[model samples]
Target: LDPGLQPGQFSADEAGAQLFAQSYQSSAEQVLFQSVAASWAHDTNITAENARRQEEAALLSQEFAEAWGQKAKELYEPIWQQFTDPQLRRIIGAVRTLGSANLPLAKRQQYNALLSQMSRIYSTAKVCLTCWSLDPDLTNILASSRSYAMLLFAWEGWHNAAGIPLKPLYEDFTALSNEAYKQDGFTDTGAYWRSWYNSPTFEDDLEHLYQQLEPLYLNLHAFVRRALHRRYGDRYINLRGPIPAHLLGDMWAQSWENIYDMVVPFPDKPNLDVTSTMLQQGWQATHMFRVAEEFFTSLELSPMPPEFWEGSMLEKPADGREVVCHASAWDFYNRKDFRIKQCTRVTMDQLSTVHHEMGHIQYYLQYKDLPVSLRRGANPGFHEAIGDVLALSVSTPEHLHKIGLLDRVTNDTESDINYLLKMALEKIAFLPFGYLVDQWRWGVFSGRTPPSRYNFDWWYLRTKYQGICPPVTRNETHFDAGAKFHVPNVTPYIRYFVSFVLQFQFHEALCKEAGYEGPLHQCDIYRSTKAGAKLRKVLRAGSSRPWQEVLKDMVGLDALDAQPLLKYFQLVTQWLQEQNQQNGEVLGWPEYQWHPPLPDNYP
Candidate 1:
């Protein structure tokens, strides 16, 4: 049960050993424990809310207990070290302090009160521990872990603060959303955020990664193609191209062909357009992660690592090769080729747009030939990490010359101004939208509002946070069936915010590594000679661990200050202002902005 054991210590050989040594036990028991949960449901003495709280508390206890049993090592360190780490300390201390009194019948009244407090602290500690243990190498592990952790905490808070148990209807509705609807085949929420949001403008101080982000992603196909060709002699199969919308429909149909074995659809209803929703998008994204990984692994030209598919690389492709994925920008086209369709002004920024897809293209190449299959990302951060890392690479001037994308000028001041402005506009304009979309999902899933109402809710928050309005007549929110791009099946909502902030963290490290003064964008990349393979080892695996661990291992820090993002964006905004001033108007302005009306109010 030791997580640190060598490959053959527990099992006879590599193939003989279970991929997940401990999660198996935990997973098995969850099923059994859930079966016992019927006691809480039907017990005569328990109220429905109390029964649910007890059931959830029991589940948490089972998770921790089973996990503790299977693990040979103390989770954090010495067993005694649990005395530190405030959250852990509080939980252990409370239990120790109340031990004898908690045993007596007459004292049960006071003990129960204390028990409730303990559960709250205990729940928080579990989340914190999970967060701490999360590997940072995944793309957005921290954000995803934080979101899940927070979701758990909210579930806890709902119980302790409001005494409301999780609603069966809410859980059922969520399940139905996953089963009935489907993701429209969009995988990376971060890419969507970058595409829909990031803009080039502002000064150096305002250069945020958001502006640069979308450009990098929107142009992924070319990035993949060029990288693969450069590394692998161009004999490989290339899937980068525009895809037909009909193909999307076909893919959707195929995905659902046999998925009903898991769970069937909920009956027809309003607001819950089973056909299109964020939940569907999330399911689609999950499948996309698999599809993209599978497609890459099947190729022999720029070969993907064997472990990648078996949960070894954790869904990322191998290192050193690039994948070029292009989809038709056309809204309507019919053919089997998978070209991404519908190019908008939002699809133009070189760094933010094109590079975002390139992030995925570049991901599989990292750790492509690792000897150890067990060495993949331990959590969501590792998966989310790949896109952010490549996106970070574009900030350097050296990156400009290496890829032949941007030209280097002898006069560096003008280049700095130009770079700074683009980055700033990105963060200010784009990140807020990413933040809002995540919040919108949280609001919908938490049952804080009705699911049918999600469209209006999305639009209301979209306008408020994104600072852009959707077309008035488009009913963009209702048709936004695509927004559900990644939800329900897995929690893709948090990845946008997680990766958004985490990219900044990586920027800080890259800047430090680049060794220049002033802001991150101004740093020179002459002496920074890290290779593609080394970076793969350090980062670019997916969901191998909680995000914090990856960051700590990579950058030697936990929390990152986001001022660099804001500072970078300042320059980008300045550039936008300058461009607007010269043109006597904002370049994209009303046409590109996506402002929508508030709830119950029409635009």
Candidate 2:
């Protein structure tokens, strides 16, 4: 029924009937055999082409999406009744539901064209800072540089490099997003996004989770604010209270955790940079990944296949054509050809990210034998959390020492405080900002935040959640939120917020399984086969069962709560409170905003 479908691809009804026949087949049936053959062809074509497209982008993703949409349209009606297996039925139903936004054939071609154009923009855009085009290794500049001026320029350059230059395209993209959500039978984009999880309480749960974490986030923010004031003095502070956003080291002050070494309370103590040590030892980027592999192996997981080495994009391509530099793990055929696409650099951040990406690969390995429809995470947040859970262990000072990456830091009050401070800056600080991005987008999609107040509402949420303000006045002329890739890509920001919380939950559980008797923050599940076995049991379930069930198998409960996270960082929270009390630091909304007069014609 659709031209974009591959030769002999089955529609949803066809696949269901064939799977049923395969399970119980006494009589030979032509229709059953035909359906079986069609399903195989569809899977083969989609998997093969997707691998090719992701590995080496030749602007082929549009073609892939068209094929997916065509098959999805055919599968729509059948999805409701064509399968006995509830998991398969639910899986196909979701695939069909997301594509309910597909336009009529004539309009569909234009949408595909727009998607291709945007894909090119994302792949090609590079952050350039004052005659120095930022390296693919952005962390080096951000982490290694001590010059405040350089950090300031680098931060501005990257933010400027994001969505603004593509203004009208972004505007059009937002419009399309709204239309797509409406077609998907959503009240708004936020509702449409929430629908993907198949959970009724997702939004409410997320709000509750954020409320639970807000106090910790505010305390971390207040501490960082005071530290910056001490370092840079009254000039930055007099710019009306709170450190200038640009001075926080990240393009957005989303994660000030990385800059902790530059501003820690114990100046006499050495702040660890594992990346520098890796470089000093003449280690290549690949070596970092080997350590990541060892952690998995220690957990009794299978090692990476030979094909992964042959197929992975381990470094930046010198090719003239622009390519996406974002780090991602790809399961090309859902099993055998798992690979990672990263511009690997020798840095502790990259090393942690490599472990995170490989977590996806290990997951693909676990569930490859399941039906194609069942080979995804129980929930997207679950998938994202797995790698980060491992990363928390991998980046632990004890884990570093265990792997001969660095000597263990002395176990003292100062070391514990420093470690907790860094973790809070990254994890706690990210909570509200992560929630705010999608919050702002939901308003935009619902027409509550119109083009006129685009920049206004962005800062409003930033201040409301982050307790930080813009160094200069921003108006609709700026698409500041679009400065992050997720905004332009329309990737849900909530998954990350969920993942940050969930990773801690997963880590605490895994640590207990490993028989660790220590503070939750210090527990490392590395080399614990018991922990690996527990994790594998959950990963192997895939989406075959509900996420709550999968989570229950690993942890005692099937709920997502901030309790584990709060417990994991309990000592740090207490320390932060004491530090804040001594410094007279109060968390949450800093009073008074002075915006410069907008031009008379400003939107």
Candidate 3:
């Protein structure tokens, strides 16, 4: 035990480290605040003048984090671990891992520059109608079109424009990124990504969670397949095999909610979609945020602070500035300063999005006083799930009716299936798709899927996990996976899979805490102060403690498990299983398929 390196002069070092944290956080906050204006300028109003201004600030931001990491890693590295002060260890550890501080300045610039080019390739690269086009027109094509041929053309044409061209660039990108990851003492970039959870078992943990719900997912897969087979027939979709990826009605097939029209279990059941109801009530863009704010306050959580209203851009600017229209939440580090930017429309989808973004704002409000290192969620998954978990409660028919967004609530069996079907298509169907994306990326980083086998390995994982395949035959000459935004952007993707499970998991816990004694699907904890307290208490702790520990404290969970998600969707699973067996349908796809047969050409 004495072999542990603890110099006798440790107490004062702890004191100094604690003091240094305050200064470090203050400076960091100021820099972040200054950078926000620059970012907001470029995002809200496109211009070379403001664009360069944002890039310069970004460089400064990266350099500062690197400088802090380097200095802190040297001074407090050896000493802080020996001392058992919780706050000190947390502060030093976060700073120690801040940026690739060990990397050379010029080398870091090279990595950043390469990323810039790759992102441009994705954003600028687009197919024309000569083929036909999130691309405003393109997004509509995938979601609205019923023709299988058009789906393949739109999906494949985009692959040619973006994914195929980016293959060589991705390999080069990975070489540099993996090196940067190693500079921070990780095995590769994938391991660095796993570190967000602060658990040694992140790899197996995610796999274990996936297996927990695999049966339910298979049931969902089987049900959706038969429904589509009845709709599209054997020519385009096979009843005995995996469904066509194009027919799933998403560019990436990550979520199949857009295809509800084809497979809605009950055509005459009361629809839960509140878009028309919200519009009939004359809801404005800002009104959605106001409603979400009311939702939080109803739960006895804090209201939106004054600064949120002043600083946020809740709608598109009327002055005709072409702003980035994606929805996002911001935390300005000034405790009371939080904002959201959204080009909100009057629709149920937009309303749900506002609730999600406002969930993040509430998280910011709750955890503002925590030290800089502890300001984030216990992990990336927890942070993303916060808003999502809230949305689950908000979207319930009971909650919607209570809030005057829905005129009626149906709790009958068919309506329940209808609602769960809608949710599972978006949530349950996404689990493996999310799992396989990072699986491919991790394989690439580890050299398991080398440059030679990129496309092959991608399809292999896709068919193995998600049971979807490319519409057209693809060889090693293609880089089809890069068509998705996450691929070219080099964004870590497993968090999305984790977030879906987490929202359901957190929802069950909050429902229980609210003392609801109904079916998991019907429990809406909209006004439960008791549930709010439990969630707020956990959010306030932030990343100061490990996520597993936070979870255990909150919900008595020792690890990430899918039990709650399974329970929430229990009715849906049973219904799917019953329907599949009665219809003489198989419940599973082959676990491996890289090359599925090409459909007969309709032409």
Residue 102 miss distance in model 3 (angstroms): 3.0
Arrange candidates by lDDT, highest first: which order? 3, 2, 1
Runs with alpha carbons beyond 4 Å of true place in candidate 3: 1-12, 45-51, 130-135, 279-282, 315-324, 591-603
Candidate 3 lands at a TM-score of 0.90
List candidate 1 segments past 4 Å from native.
1-382, 395-398, 410-414, 425-428, 473-484, 487-491, 514-519, 522-537, 540-546, 573-603
- Tell me the deviation in Å of residue 489 in model 2: 2.2
Q: TM-score, each model?
A: 0.41, 0.85, 0.90
Candidate that beats the other on lDDT, 2 or 3, i.e. the better one: 3
Question: What Cα-based lDDT does every candidate model obtain?
Answer: 0.34, 0.68, 0.77
Candidate 1 residues 379-438, lDDT tens each? 333445444554455445555445333345443555554444333334333355555655
Worst 10 residues of 2 by lDDT: 23-32
The sequence of per-residue lDDT tens digits that candidate 2 reaches over residues 1-603 is 223223234534756445432321211122223333332232222233433333222123323334444455564454555567676556545544444234445444445445445544544556652344334544456655655556655655555565566556666766766666576567767777776577888879888988889889877777777776676666555333445566666667788766877667785654655667888888776886777887899899978888788877777766643445667777755246677777788777778789889988898889878766566788888888888898888767787788777777888888777777777777888888888888888888788988778788888888788777665555677777876667765677877887888898899899999999898888888889999999999889988898887888788888898998999788889988888889777665445473222223422
